[PDB]
């Protein structure tokens, strides 16, 4: 039984994050536990406070018409518990619930680990003989607790796109609101864990430029390559398959190439040295001693700019 | 309480995909959240627009006879919320719900990774004293969000096969509709992560043909074999057990053979060389240096054509 | 309120498999989605066709006494949806639902991977003031769809034991039926993935019999043993702990033994060679070059018969 | 509305195991699907066997006062279906349900793998204006289905402690019964899988005592040590973190020690042998050849008794 | 419909922990199953003990106004069952339920493994036309069963902070109570599992200071570093990504540094030795033999204080 409106009935939304958690890189989903704020004027409920009761009359959800506010991007239906319904003397209805859902939102892994993300939560509402429009009240969007975690992430801003986007979907109008959570990944742990160690085993790998023994140099380059494969896999596991090109995934394949050309180098040193031409053999290696780190530090600078700075 | 019909009762379906996610290669199941659209004429509820009510009279599901529309390939029973029931004036019912299910549909790993898949979602309905037929409306089946994800896939087309399939099952007739999601795998990461590194360790594998020392030659071929077993396991892990032969499983086993015959070669070289026949020893290896890459580049061409282009 | 019976009240069962999926080796559980078909005569419901209504009268679950039919081997309770109830004129009730459960059934890993299994689904019923007995109707028990999967398994036959087993449990009688889904594993992938590579690394392992250098010979056997431990663990992981001896767990342990006696061989050969007794050193090894593959191919045959052909 | 009792009302319990499964070592939880049997005298429902009805009157749960019986050590609320409520003439109600829960019970990993465990299932009941006390009926507890699995475990005895323990909890008295599932682990697969291979790589580790070469001897002890770390991690992985000392975690640490002292030994052999004092060098190694198996076989005999035999 | 009050309605809370379990470090979540204890006076229900009935009258949740008591840091809505409602004559309502929820509480990994943690459980409540205040009664907060596990943790004390925190949240007042579960990690398994083995392979690593052969000295450092990375990964995996610096993650990076400088040392020794200046080489190596354990034992002493003792 919808409130008879002369023109669109405006539903006012707002979201207050209480708990945020379990952002899945692989799944591209995170989880929210929050307050939902709906308000609309249904004037049929105005009881004129003096004549009976008190200033505000509270109703149970079964006695009132509520706009059905559905979430757009979410895996299952939202779980909700109705906290309060309060009808004003003039007939203004205030609805507040507490819901917990898991949100499904795209992530941009181009800059991983260092990347910044913006997560999305959409509220649509569908009309009947009246049109409903959801619209954001910045007073109920100011909300989240100072205590919200979202482990491994720094939380910048929770806001709402105030202008609803109005679809026509299956012979009716629906109003959509876009709430936005901006977060940035905490990259520190990755340096002592992934970055620096990978760099180390990479340096250790081409330390073989100071040695004349083939055997020691194959043990070297190959047994570092194994560990690099291990790191590659470890990082490749915790991340979804991208259609586009990642930064870390770039430098990791680069390091693959440097391992190959390293193997090529020492092999060339061997064949040349059993051809009894060490004159050239020491020359190649001594060149490598500079060329390999320079090409690296160069290409990394090349790569660095091409992603972040451009 | 079915509407008493003159001939088969026709129910008109349509699906609007809202969110897609969790396509599980191993499980051969994916997850869908969409709109379900049913419309049918149950004439027993007769209006008079002028005499009473308005153009449209809204009912709650308990007051109406609804067709029982079940999904065929789904794990557990499908979960749903009725969004709207609007009875048109003539006794035409417009039923719209929003459902979330996990669909069980076959996958083809033959061309893996590169292949296209066509996912199936089947709708049945069963009759009682009247027969029912479900049928697709291409206007309501085009459904999709321009935002639908299915991470790691390119989504081409969502459609429905217009002709209902009518089974006879346990002394009653059922009608089945086939909705199709045509998607193609996004193959990008597979090159910098799996393919190319595997090729690299394969080339590194036979880099030992330029060396005369047995020891370096066992370290090379074996420690590359290890990495190849590692990749083998890595790819074997994320994929279901195939009754047929995969492309990647083909070339991977081929690469295994090349590690094997490489091993035989270097062994034969050592025994030959301590027999003081370096005449033969340098000759065999020098043959290997060309034959091995060539057979591969051939075998891949042999293999590649044999799968995709034929 | 059960129908007053002159003698045992007979319920007629049947299952129509719709979906099969998720057979868990470790868990020894699989998952079924099917039709359940129950039928019984309640003569209290026979109003006879002519006096009112029609040939068949449909009832809602709340208005009829329904036999309470429970599944025996199942982890948690089954989820079910009542499809139809049709009472015939004479008082014959036709009950049909669709259920989804996960069944817990024993598996035999002796012949693994090559093994065949027969999965069980048991249906019971408990009595009250009348005794109930379940019995199979081969017309509804033929149940299967030509589309049923059970990915990684070949489905042979779904049938039901017509004769019920009658327990006395806690001062009342219960009737049990045994439904059987007979399946055989798809064993193909194990050859390009586990079997053949294990054999390769096993042969490559004992390639060291053609060389006199100790160092190369320790690198060989050890770095192959690593890979065999990897395969051992990988297969051991996806399989439950067996109280008995598997074929695969057998040949894998046998292969372990060959790795150990190999180590003993090269160990003896070096010490023999620095004792300046190459006479014995080349002799032992030359015996090994034939003996080792001979023992394998034999022991495999010994083992193979002892499991399969016996 | 509890039955008016002259003194404490005694509830008679019993459990009948149907399925046992999913014993999780890490979780220290298992899963049971069984029968719960309660019987109590509520005299307000009195017999008038002749006056009306029959010998036994069956009630639906909502029409009787039923005791609320809750499980103590459990994760979530227990899942249950009412099988039968049959009130005996005397006002004795016979209540029978079927439940499925996952129980949380301590495990003792002191003797792992070989250990026996006793799982606990606790039933409490809370009083109101009458006191309730539960007590076991050995007729309904005396059994389990002969088919109960608990994969990877041997089932000894299902029993119940007949004496109730009465807590005072939040100003009311509660009665607790301790049901015990006494089981012992199936330890066979661990030998062909874990034990023996570790032993082999350990023996192989110190086989280097028959060789004078340093490089081959670092290869041996180190690459056996690697595989031992692998097994260590493998076992440490499937088991929860102990506050106490395990047997396997002990001998594994001992084995770590032996790999360490092996490396120390061969290193010492090298520095001594390049100092040109082979007189001492051959002596040390020859001593190790016996002491190492002796210290080991001794330390193990010591360890074995201290756990099992004491 | 709240009890009409002259001033704030005081709710008295309390918690009795029954089970603690499944503390997840990565997740920073644990699970509790406990008693919730509420008591408040609603005077509208009046005492007429003599006039009718008895001392205490029991009500079903639907007939009384109940405070809506919500948990703050929790993932999903808590699932709960009402154990008892007994209203005392004076209008004292005694409410007791049993709930199972999963709590989300921060953990501090700075001292991991050795760390002590304090888990938080917050109870808020929201007002209507009356203001509500929750407050702790330490007699009902005394709760935990002597049986509570939290496997791998020692449970010290479960308490409640007596002063409620009173928020003003979205135009209404809410009252929050802070419950604390103080636990200390059982750090024992970590010595035989992670700590000691890592220490051993670290000593084995620089055992190469007693050897002059390049090959053996590269095999050493490399094959120890590989396993050390393996341990790094094993630990980094079971731990969430830290924004700050952990103790274990610190000493692990330090150890990485010592491996790097070790490789550097042997590398310099070889080239120095083929420069035919072993005079310098043996000096360097002999300096290392003390400096490395000394610097280590120093740096470890330095690091340890910086975390724990300050």
Tab-separated table of N, CA and C in Angstrom, chain D residues 26-28 68 70-77 104-107 122 124 126-128 167 169-172 174 176 214-215 218-219 221-223 225-226 229 232-233 236-237 240-246 249 252-253 256-257 259-260 263-264 267 270-271 274, chain E residues 14-16 18-22 31 33 35-37 56 58 81-84 86 96 98 100 140 145 147 149 151-152 154 186 188-194 196-197 200-201 203-204 207-208 210-213 215-217 219-220 223-224 227 230-231 234 289:
chain	number	residue	atom	x	y	z
D	26	UNK	N	43.041	-30.491	13.521
D	26	UNK	CA	43.321	-29.082	13.755
D	26	UNK	C	42.241	-28.412	14.587
D	27	UNK	N	40.992	-28.631	14.196
D	27	UNK	CA	39.858	-28.013	14.872
D	27	UNK	C	39.617	-28.582	16.264
D	28	UNK	N	40.028	-29.832	16.462
D	28	UNK	CA	39.700	-30.584	17.666
D	28	UNK	C	38.180	-30.723	17.701
D	68	UNK	N	13.913	-28.504	27.748
D	68	UNK	CA	14.881	-27.934	26.821
D	68	UNK	C	16.262	-28.500	27.140
D	70	UNK	N	20.113	-28.833	26.062
D	70	UNK	CA	21.076	-28.184	25.179
D	70	UNK	C	22.435	-28.876	25.255
D	71	UNK	N	23.200	-28.820	24.170
D	71	UNK	CA	24.544	-29.394	24.157
D	71	UNK	C	25.547	-28.394	24.686
D	72	UNK	N	26.511	-28.883	25.450
D	72	UNK	CA	27.490	-28.003	26.053
D	72	UNK	C	28.606	-27.658	25.100
D	73	UNK	N	29.443	-28.625	24.757
D	73	UNK	CA	30.568	-28.272	23.918
D	73	UNK	C	30.198	-28.428	22.458
D	74	UNK	N	29.834	-27.308	21.836
D	74	UNK	CA	29.367	-27.292	20.450
D	74	UNK	C	29.623	-25.892	19.900
D	75	UNK	N	29.837	-25.780	18.592
D	75	UNK	CA	30.107	-24.501	17.948
D	75	UNK	C	28.831	-23.668	17.811
D	76	UNK	N	27.927	-24.158	16.961
D	76	UNK	CA	26.636	-23.519	16.699
D	76	UNK	C	25.492	-24.226	17.395
D	77	UNK	N	24.299	-23.671	17.249
D	77	UNK	CA	23.117	-24.316	17.784
D	77	UNK	C	22.920	-25.648	17.049
D	104	UNK	N	32.704	-30.002	19.831
D	104	UNK	CA	34.023	-29.494	20.103
D	104	UNK	C	34.569	-30.257	21.307
D	105	UNK	N	35.534	-31.140	21.074
D	105	UNK	CA	36.120	-31.925	22.157
D	105	UNK	C	37.638	-31.949	22.053
D	106	UNK	N	38.315	-31.824	23.197
D	106	UNK	CA	39.774	-31.824	23.291
D	106	UNK	C	40.406	-33.054	22.683
D	107	UNK	N	41.570	-32.893	22.066
D	107	UNK	CA	42.375	-34.042	21.676
D	107	UNK	C	43.763	-33.930	22.299
D	122	UNK	N	28.586	-33.399	25.765
D	122	UNK	CA	27.979	-33.079	27.056
D	122	UNK	C	26.549	-32.606	26.866
D	124	UNK	N	23.516	-30.666	28.806
D	124	UNK	CA	22.944	-30.052	30.004
D	124	UNK	C	21.446	-29.779	29.922
D	126	UNK	N	18.549	-26.986	32.168
D	126	UNK	CA	18.357	-25.932	33.171
D	126	UNK	C	16.934	-25.966	33.741
D	127	UNK	N	16.794	-25.613	35.014
D	127	UNK	CA	15.542	-25.808	35.737
D	127	UNK	C	14.654	-24.565	35.682
D	128	UNK	N	13.426	-24.633	36.200
D	128	UNK	CA	12.667	-23.388	36.323
D	128	UNK	C	12.036	-23.051	37.686
D	167	UNK	N	25.811	-28.359	38.264
D	167	UNK	CA	26.323	-27.014	38.399
D	167	UNK	C	25.252	-26.128	39.013
D	169	UNK	N	24.325	-22.449	37.984
D	169	UNK	CA	24.721	-21.495	36.954
D	169	UNK	C	23.747	-20.339	36.820
D	170	UNK	N	24.230	-19.164	37.210
D	170	UNK	CA	23.438	-17.946	37.207
D	170	UNK	C	22.123	-18.172	37.960
D	171	UNK	N	22.251	-18.441	39.254
D	171	UNK	CA	21.118	-18.600	40.166
D	171	UNK	C	20.029	-19.591	39.726
D	172	UNK	N	20.446	-20.699	39.130
D	172	UNK	CA	19.561	-21.828	38.875
D	172	UNK	C	20.465	-23.057	38.778
D	174	UNK	N	21.785	-26.609	37.091
D	174	UNK	CA	21.783	-27.342	35.826
D	174	UNK	C	22.454	-28.711	35.913
D	176	UNK	N	24.426	-31.871	33.980
D	176	UNK	CA	25.274	-32.192	32.836
D	176	UNK	C	25.625	-33.683	32.765
D	214	UNK	N	84.426	-33.796	0.130
D	214	UNK	CA	83.636	-32.760	0.798
D	214	UNK	C	82.372	-32.345	0.048
D	215	UNK	N	82.510	-31.979	-1.224
D	215	UNK	CA	81.372	-31.512	-2.020
D	215	UNK	C	80.207	-32.506	-2.023
D	218	UNK	N	78.488	-32.432	1.340
D	218	UNK	CA	77.621	-31.310	1.657
D	218	UNK	C	76.338	-31.534	0.873
D	219	UNK	N	76.468	-32.025	-0.358
D	219	UNK	CA	75.297	-32.352	-1.154
D	219	UNK	C	74.389	-33.323	-0.412
D	221	UNK	N	74.208	-34.425	3.062
D	221	UNK	CA	73.600	-33.978	4.305
D	221	UNK	C	72.622	-32.832	4.058
D	222	UNK	N	72.976	-31.916	3.161
D	222	UNK	CA	72.119	-30.762	2.928
D	222	UNK	C	70.829	-31.147	2.208
D	223	UNK	N	70.952	-31.851	1.094
D	223	UNK	CA	69.777	-32.227	0.318
D	223	UNK	C	68.915	-33.316	0.966
D	225	UNK	N	68.638	-33.001	4.374
D	225	UNK	CA	68.100	-32.040	5.333
D	225	UNK	C	66.917	-31.273	4.769
D	226	UNK	N	67.007	-30.923	3.492
D	226	UNK	CA	65.924	-30.248	2.803
D	226	UNK	C	64.647	-31.080	2.858
D	229	UNK	N	63.148	-31.132	6.211
D	229	UNK	CA	62.403	-29.905	6.472
D	229	UNK	C	61.036	-29.990	5.825
D	232	UNK	N	58.954	-32.302	7.898
D	232	UNK	CA	58.686	-31.530	9.110
D	232	UNK	C	57.508	-30.572	8.940
D	233	UNK	N	57.565	-29.762	7.884
D	233	UNK	CA	56.532	-28.775	7.581
D	233	UNK	C	55.217	-29.472	7.271
D	236	UNK	N	53.766	-30.711	10.604
D	236	UNK	CA	53.491	-29.517	11.406
D	236	UNK	C	52.260	-28.749	10.898
D	237	UNK	N	51.951	-28.964	9.625
D	237	UNK	CA	50.897	-28.264	8.914
D	237	UNK	C	49.503	-28.787	9.250
D	240	UNK	N	47.463	-28.877	15.033
D	240	UNK	CA	47.417	-27.639	15.815
D	240	UNK	C	48.656	-27.427	16.684
D	241	UNK	N	48.869	-26.188	17.104
D	241	UNK	CA	50.031	-25.835	17.902
D	241	UNK	C	49.872	-26.331	19.334
D	242	UNK	N	50.810	-27.166	19.770
D	242	UNK	CA	50.752	-27.771	21.092
D	242	UNK	C	51.381	-26.890	22.161
D	243	UNK	N	50.710	-26.792	23.315
D	243	UNK	CA	51.307	-26.175	24.504
D	243	UNK	C	52.364	-27.091	25.105
D	244	UNK	N	52.253	-28.376	24.777
D	244	UNK	CA	53.117	-29.417	25.318
D	244	UNK	C	54.020	-30.005	24.243
D	245	UNK	N	54.797	-31.017	24.619
D	245	UNK	CA	55.734	-31.654	23.697
D	245	UNK	C	55.173	-32.946	23.113
D	246	UNK	N	55.087	-32.976	21.790
D	246	UNK	CA	54.700	-34.167	21.054
D	246	UNK	C	55.878	-35.138	20.902
D	249	UNK	N	57.166	-34.610	17.047
D	249	UNK	CA	57.828	-33.317	17.029
D	249	UNK	C	59.146	-33.374	17.780
D	252	UNK	N	61.599	-35.550	15.445
D	252	UNK	CA	61.864	-34.749	14.252
D	252	UNK	C	62.948	-33.716	14.566
D	253	UNK	N	62.934	-33.234	15.805
D	253	UNK	CA	63.875	-32.229	16.265
D	253	UNK	C	65.234	-32.867	16.507
D	256	UNK	N	66.680	-33.253	13.187
D	256	UNK	CA	67.282	-31.955	12.863
D	256	UNK	C	68.691	-31.861	13.462
D	257	UNK	N	68.799	-32.306	14.710
D	257	UNK	CA	70.060	-32.256	15.428
D	257	UNK	C	71.100	-33.099	14.705
D	259	UNK	N	71.213	-34.009	11.533
D	259	UNK	CA	71.617	-33.402	10.271
D	259	UNK	C	72.651	-32.323	10.568
D	260	UNK	N	72.412	-31.564	11.642
D	260	UNK	CA	73.347	-30.515	12.046
D	260	UNK	C	74.727	-31.063	12.384
D	263	UNK	N	76.585	-32.290	9.262
D	263	UNK	CA	77.257	-31.174	8.586
D	263	UNK	C	78.520	-30.737	9.332
D	264	UNK	N	78.413	-30.614	10.653
D	264	UNK	CA	79.558	-30.228	11.469
D	264	UNK	C	80.701	-31.215	11.256
D	267	UNK	N	82.301	-31.017	7.689
D	267	UNK	CA	83.045	-29.750	7.627
D	267	UNK	C	84.400	-29.906	8.316
D	270	UNK	N	86.750	-31.927	6.248
D	270	UNK	CA	87.363	-31.111	5.198
D	270	UNK	C	88.535	-30.264	5.698
D	271	UNK	N	88.295	-29.446	6.730
D	271	UNK	CA	89.358	-28.556	7.225
D	271	UNK	C	90.558	-29.370	7.710
D	274	UNK	N	92.487	-30.906	4.489
D	274	UNK	CA	93.308	-29.956	3.735
D	274	UNK	C	94.464	-29.416	4.582
E	14	UNK	N	25.482	-9.107	31.323
E	14	UNK	CA	26.484	-10.055	31.766
E	14	UNK	C	26.732	-11.121	30.711
E	15	UNK	N	27.937	-11.686	30.712
E	15	UNK	CA	28.333	-12.703	29.741
E	15	UNK	C	28.887	-13.945	30.421
E	16	UNK	N	28.454	-15.131	29.997
E	16	UNK	CA	29.115	-16.346	30.493
E	16	UNK	C	29.706	-17.109	29.309
E	18	UNK	N	30.940	-19.990	27.190
E	18	UNK	CA	30.891	-21.438	27.300
E	18	UNK	C	32.016	-22.002	26.438
E	19	UNK	N	32.024	-21.681	25.151
E	19	UNK	CA	33.131	-22.112	24.320
E	19	UNK	C	33.882	-20.954	23.685
E	20	UNK	N	35.204	-21.077	23.685
E	20	UNK	CA	36.079	-20.211	22.900
E	20	UNK	C	36.844	-21.089	21.945
E	21	UNK	N	37.021	-20.590	20.730
E	21	UNK	CA	37.583	-21.401	19.676
E	21	UNK	C	37.790	-20.614	18.413
E	22	UNK	N	38.587	-21.194	17.529
E	22	UNK	CA	38.798	-20.668	16.196
E	22	UNK	C	39.239	-19.212	16.212
E	31	UNK	N	35.713	-16.781	17.644
E	31	UNK	CA	34.312	-17.168	17.742
E	31	UNK	C	33.930	-17.440	19.181
E	33	UNK	N	30.733	-18.727	21.872
E	33	UNK	CA	29.399	-19.214	22.193
E	33	UNK	C	29.172	-19.084	23.690
E	35	UNK	N	26.548	-17.126	27.179
E	35	UNK	CA	25.305	-16.653	27.767
E	35	UNK	C	25.243	-15.131	27.727
E	36	UNK	N	24.093	-14.585	27.324
E	36	UNK	CA	23.846	-13.163	27.516
E	36	UNK	C	22.829	-13.049	28.630
E	37	UNK	N	23.169	-12.219	29.614
E	37	UNK	CA	22.380	-12.026	30.825
E	37	UNK	C	21.848	-10.602	30.939
E	56	UNK	N	6.850	-15.925	40.798
E	56	UNK	CA	7.384	-15.545	39.498
E	56	UNK	C	6.516	-15.978	38.322
E	58	UNK	N	6.407	-16.324	34.148
E	58	UNK	CA	7.231	-16.464	32.938
E	58	UNK	C	6.541	-16.004	31.642
E	81	UNK	N	19.315	-17.900	21.040
E	81	UNK	CA	18.124	-18.593	21.521
E	81	UNK	C	17.760	-18.162	22.940
E	82	UNK	N	16.486	-17.834	23.141
E	82	UNK	CA	16.022	-17.355	24.431
E	82	UNK	C	15.878	-18.505	25.397
E	83	UNK	N	16.688	-18.496	26.453
E	83	UNK	CA	16.673	-19.590	27.419
E	83	UNK	C	15.534	-19.438	28.410
E	84	UNK	N	15.437	-18.246	28.998
E	84	UNK	CA	14.399	-17.964	29.985
E	84	UNK	C	14.029	-16.479	30.088
E	86	UNK	N	11.917	-14.527	33.141
E	86	UNK	CA	11.174	-14.593	34.389
E	86	UNK	C	11.041	-13.188	34.934
E	96	UNK	N	17.443	-14.254	30.063
E	96	UNK	CA	18.642	-15.044	29.814
E	96	UNK	C	18.593	-15.758	28.472
E	98	UNK	N	21.042	-17.656	25.084
E	98	UNK	CA	22.326	-18.196	24.677
E	98	UNK	C	22.636	-17.893	23.219
E	100	UNK	N	25.580	-17.402	19.871
E	100	UNK	CA	26.846	-17.760	19.267
E	100	UNK	C	27.119	-16.763	18.154
E	140	UNK	N	27.758	-11.657	36.911
E	140	UNK	CA	27.385	-12.379	35.690
E	140	UNK	C	28.472	-12.314	34.595
E	145	UNK	N	33.659	-21.201	31.296
E	145	UNK	CA	33.662	-22.536	31.816
E	145	UNK	C	35.110	-22.815	32.058
E	147	UNK	N	36.495	-25.096	31.209
E	147	UNK	CA	36.843	-25.925	30.076
E	147	UNK	C	37.235	-25.150	28.810
E	149	UNK	N	38.856	-23.419	25.726
E	149	UNK	CA	40.124	-23.788	25.102
E	149	UNK	C	40.925	-22.659	24.496
E	151	UNK	N	42.536	-22.944	21.522
E	151	UNK	CA	43.677	-23.844	21.347
E	151	UNK	C	44.955	-23.112	20.960
E	152	UNK	N	46.038	-23.393	21.670
E	152	UNK	CA	47.285	-22.717	21.391
E	152	UNK	C	47.353	-21.395	22.122
E	154	UNK	N	46.705	-19.486	26.222
E	154	UNK	CA	46.386	-19.568	27.636
E	154	UNK	C	45.399	-18.463	27.968
E	186	UNK	N	50.698	-19.540	23.504
E	186	UNK	CA	51.551	-20.622	23.922
E	186	UNK	C	52.598	-20.731	22.831
E	188	UNK	N	55.322	-22.443	22.525
E	188	UNK	CA	56.231	-23.565	22.696
E	188	UNK	C	56.566	-24.284	21.402
E	189	UNK	N	55.546	-24.683	20.645
E	189	UNK	CA	55.732	-25.448	19.406
E	189	UNK	C	56.674	-24.763	18.417
E	190	UNK	N	56.721	-23.442	18.511
E	190	UNK	CA	57.523	-22.637	17.612
E	190	UNK	C	59.031	-22.896	17.744
E	191	UNK	N	59.496	-23.274	18.931
E	191	UNK	CA	60.909	-23.612	19.072
E	191	UNK	C	61.283	-24.903	18.303
E	192	UNK	N	60.621	-26.053	18.583
E	192	UNK	CA	61.010	-27.235	17.798
E	192	UNK	C	60.599	-27.174	16.332
E	193	UNK	N	59.688	-26.279	15.972
E	193	UNK	CA	59.163	-26.282	14.613
E	193	UNK	C	59.847	-25.250	13.718
E	194	UNK	N	59.772	-23.987	14.120
E	194	UNK	CA	60.306	-22.880	13.328
E	194	UNK	C	61.668	-22.383	13.825
E	196	UNK	N	64.277	-23.214	16.195
E	196	UNK	CA	65.477	-24.043	16.234
E	196	UNK	C	65.962	-24.562	14.867
E	197	UNK	N	65.062	-25.127	14.023
E	197	UNK	CA	65.529	-25.556	12.692
E	197	UNK	C	66.159	-24.435	11.858
E	200	UNK	N	69.610	-23.715	13.184
E	200	UNK	CA	70.496	-24.767	12.682
E	200	UNK	C	70.941	-24.558	11.238
E	201	UNK	N	69.991	-24.392	10.321
E	201	UNK	CA	70.361	-24.184	8.922
E	201	UNK	C	71.140	-22.872	8.744
E	203	UNK	N	73.411	-21.827	10.998
E	203	UNK	CA	74.773	-22.184	11.401
E	203	UNK	C	75.457	-23.047	10.314
E	204	UNK	N	74.753	-24.083	9.862
E	204	UNK	CA	75.183	-24.884	8.713
E	204	UNK	C	75.547	-24.001	7.522
E	207	UNK	N	78.935	-22.555	8.047
E	207	UNK	CA	79.948	-23.609	8.219
E	207	UNK	C	81.010	-23.552	7.112
E	208	UNK	N	80.718	-22.824	6.035
E	208	UNK	CA	81.622	-22.719	4.895
E	208	UNK	C	82.889	-21.905	5.191
E	210	UNK	N	85.049	-22.756	7.222
E	210	UNK	CA	86.080	-23.747	7.488
E	210	UNK	C	86.526	-24.452	6.201
E	211	UNK	N	86.035	-23.987	5.052
E	211	UNK	CA	86.380	-24.623	3.778
E	211	UNK	C	86.932	-23.636	2.740
E	212	UNK	N	87.920	-24.091	1.967
E	212	UNK	CA	88.589	-23.268	0.951
E	212	UNK	C	88.074	-23.532	-0.476
E	213	UNK	N	87.202	-24.527	-0.626
E	213	UNK	CA	86.698	-24.906	-1.944
E	213	UNK	C	85.486	-24.057	-2.287
E	215	UNK	N	83.139	-24.320	-4.785
E	215	UNK	CA	81.935	-25.096	-5.076
E	215	UNK	C	81.133	-25.502	-3.829
E	216	UNK	N	81.808	-26.110	-2.859
E	216	UNK	CA	81.135	-26.568	-1.649
E	216	UNK	C	80.573	-25.398	-0.855
E	217	UNK	N	81.263	-24.267	-0.949
E	217	UNK	CA	80.903	-23.080	-0.191
E	217	UNK	C	79.744	-22.321	-0.817
E	219	UNK	N	77.385	-24.148	-2.668
E	219	UNK	CA	76.333	-25.130	-2.410
E	219	UNK	C	75.759	-24.926	-1.010
E	220	UNK	N	76.651	-24.740	-0.038
E	220	UNK	CA	76.238	-24.504	1.342
E	220	UNK	C	75.271	-23.332	1.462
E	223	UNK	N	71.889	-23.640	-0.696
E	223	UNK	CA	70.927	-24.641	-0.261
E	223	UNK	C	70.433	-24.425	1.168
E	224	UNK	N	71.133	-23.603	1.943
E	224	UNK	CA	70.570	-23.166	3.216
E	224	UNK	C	69.610	-21.973	3.048
E	227	UNK	N	65.959	-23.064	1.809
E	227	UNK	CA	65.134	-23.524	2.916
E	227	UNK	C	64.745	-22.358	3.833
E	230	UNK	N	61.963	-20.674	2.359
E	230	UNK	CA	60.816	-21.564	2.552
E	230	UNK	C	60.160	-21.302	3.906
E	231	UNK	N	60.955	-21.294	4.973
E	231	UNK	CA	60.446	-20.911	6.294
E	231	UNK	C	59.826	-19.489	6.303
E	234	UNK	N	56.481	-19.806	4.795
E	234	UNK	CA	55.604	-20.521	5.712
E	234	UNK	C	55.037	-19.605	6.792
E	289	UNK	N	84.876	-16.109	10.935
E	289	UNK	CA	84.558	-17.209	11.873
E	289	UNK	C	84.118	-16.792	13.283
